[PDB]
Paper text:
The SorC family of transcriptional regulators plays a crucial role in controlling the carbohydrate metabolism and quorum sensing. A typical SorC protein comprises an N-terminal DNA-binding domain (DBD) of a helix–turn–helix (HTH) motif, along with a C-terminal Rossmann-like fold effector-binding domain (EBD). SorC repressors generally form tetramers as they bind to their operators located in promoter regions of regulated genes.
DeoR acts as a repressor of the dra–nupC–pdp operon, which encodes catabolic enzymes for the utilization of deoxyribose and deoxyribonucleoside when other preferred carbon sources are lacking. Successful crystallization was achieved for a complex with an 18 bp long DNA duplex (referred to here as OL18) that contained the first two palindromic binding sites of the operator (5′-ATTGAACAAAATTTCAAT-3′), specifically the left-half operator sequence. The crystal structure was determined by molecular replacement and refined to a resolution of 3.7 Å. The asymmetric unit comprised two physiological protein dimers, each bound to one OL18 duplex. Each monomer within the dimer contains an N-terminal HTH-type domain and a C-terminal effector-binding domain of a three-layer (α/β/α) sandwich architecture containing a double Rossmann fold. The antiparallel β-sheet formed upon DBD dimerization results in swapped positions of the EBD domains with respect to the N-terminal DBDs. The dimeric interface is provided only by the N-terminal domains; interactions of the C-terminal domains within the dimer are negligible. Within the crystal, this interaction was observed between two symmetry-related DeoR dimers originating from the neighboring asymmetric unit. The DeoR dimer interacts with the major DNA groove and the DBDs within each dimer are spatially separated by about one DNA turn. A tetrameric assembly is formed through the interaction of EBDs with the dimer from the neighboring asymmetric unit in the crystal lattice, and this crystallographic tetramer allowed us to construct our biologically relevant model of DeoR bound to the full operator.
Residue numbers in the entry:
A (entry chain B): 2 to 312
B (entry chain A): 1 to 312
DNA sequence: ATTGAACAAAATTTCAAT
DNA sequence: ATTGAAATTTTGTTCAAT
């Protein structure tokens, strides 16, 4: 009684799993084209072919709402990434970072920047704007040397150009050998306004770093091999090379007190402190940072965002 | 790459399908052109926004797989839909599934044996690159001096290697030696044996079954010297790795298969996953003899050939 | 219930413009 | 690149036709 059902199931499939024409189907079945159309209608009617309007948008909205409540943030943006490998996440996040900055930055904003290959990516997306009275400042200390390009210079430059301003560098190394040295530098007439502008910034954009032995800070030699072994133990991640713990506290003030850059606690004051991070290799650093309540805007992927809530 | 267009596009697709609205109609509510609406719908399908699934009695597909999954004692049986019953049409579709399966299957530190074949090469091309490490990929099948079609042997194993962040282990030997003694002491050469041994160590194996007709050039390259060509034609049903067998999956002539190069057949049964991709209306006899020989424990086959199998 | 020419409404897609 | 207009198939739909 049901050799028709089989045909309807057979023909309907060809027209959906082969991208076949109605007339393509009528050829092999040696039947009329109108008949084939009727068969397809019949299959839809009894539900041999069922159609679904999956919309991840809704999912992402709600997930964000949880992170907003969980860590008490102003904004949480969950960005869809098709892949959970680090690279794919980075790219998708980066491009959203760009868009957000473009939408967010208004005439007369004071914008603090950092460097990082993360940070560079967000910048690279064009994000140009006819904005006025905007200034852009370096928040993170620099290097003597590195095996990879830091892209530090170009990073802040591109930000500047895009905002019809020019860069305020912080022309200092990330770490001084001695704390007294560090104190006396930050007080210099010129240096101080740069740090002060750092603190004045109403926008701040940064990533959090990893603990892998492939970290730039580990490689470059401004840290004791002996102390790094101890420091790594107590430090989940870093923002601008100030290291925190699983509760967001400075793991070592001894070392932090000889580290250059705007101060972590300053971040809490800022009208928008924007963390972009993601990647399942980084989840440890993100929890610490949000616990420290250093960000009030979070940009994160759904892989990492899932791992943060469901834990 | 706009949040609004993704939202607007999906809403329109939702409207067109769910409430059964015409593109013209959708264009009314959205106050846009009819062509635009059509493009939006295409975009939604493209990014997988709208998903269409076809359901049926299990016989048609799925269980169609389980019945022989259990009949031949195979671990896995995958029946792939092909819109047509000719070889090319089937091969193409099987090939693409082959690629996907390998991508899902191959894990860090696998030993992967492959072969060559017009079949094998398409699976190879449709292979997806993968973030995997410690993987090794080895040649299981002997080679040729010459052929009228390109064997694609080299590129086949190369593409597999590249995709798995390893490099190729070739077997630099002819498929057949004139004399069995020659063959034996070649296999014992310290360099060669590492390769054959790695062949036996492989926990994954991927191969097709060449039919009697297919290896007519094996017949035609002066091997088997004909007095054996006859013996093989009538008896053998197929050939995996240019080794032959009969309908009950048994080496047809051990005399001949003792001067043949490649990873031994019986080794295939030992492997954690031995994956046969074959199908085709003209090629069922071979599959019959390969699955009976208990060589494969994973089968990838089309529905035309799969039904013809259950008709024994 | 059921074909299928012939017609008729419905998407596809090039063509031109912005 | 994008949007509509315009033409062309592509899907549906009346009609009993040869």
């Amino acid at each position: 009684d049901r050799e028709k059902q089989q045909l309807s199931i057979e023909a309907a499939r060809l027209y959906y799993q082969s991208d076949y024409s109605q007339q393509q189907i009528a050829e092999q079945l040696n039947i009329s084209r109108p008949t084939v159309s009727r068969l397809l209608q019949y299959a839809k009617e009894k539900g041999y072919v069922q159609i679904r309007v999956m919309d991840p948008f809704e999912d992402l909205d709600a997930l964000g709402s949880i992170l907003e409540e969980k860590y008490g943030l102003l904004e949480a943006h969950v960005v869809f990434s098709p892949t959970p490998d680090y690279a794919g996440i980075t790219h998708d996040l980066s491009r959203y970072g760009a868009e957000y900055m473009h939408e967010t930055v208004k005439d007369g904003d004071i914008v603090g920047v950092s460097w990082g290959t993360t940070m560079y990516q967000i910048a690279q997306n064009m994000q140009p704007k006819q904005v006025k009275g905007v200034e852009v400042v370096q928040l993170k200390g620099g290097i003597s040397h590195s095996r990879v390009n830091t892209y530090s210079a170009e990073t802040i430059q591109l930000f500047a150009e895009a905002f019809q301003t020019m860069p305020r560098y912080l022309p200092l190394p990330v770490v001084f050998d001695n704390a007294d040295v560090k104190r006396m530098v930050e007080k210099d007439r010129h240096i101080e306004r740069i740090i002060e502008m750092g603190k004045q910034a109403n926008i701040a954009l940064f990533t959090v770093g990893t603990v892998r032995d492939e970290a730039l800070l580990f490689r470059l030699g401004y840290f004791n091999e002996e102390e790094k072994a101890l420091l790594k133990k107590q430090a989940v991640g870093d923002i601008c090379s100030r290291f925190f713990d699983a509760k967001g506290n400075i793991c070592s003030s001894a070392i932090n007190d000889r580290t250059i850059g705007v101060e972590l606690q300053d971040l809490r004051l800022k009208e928008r402190s924007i963390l972009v991070a993601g990647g399942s290799r980084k989840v440890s650093s993100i929890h610490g940072a949000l616990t420290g309540k250093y960000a009030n805007v979070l940009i994160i992927d759904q892989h990492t965002a899932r791992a943060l809530v469901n834990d």
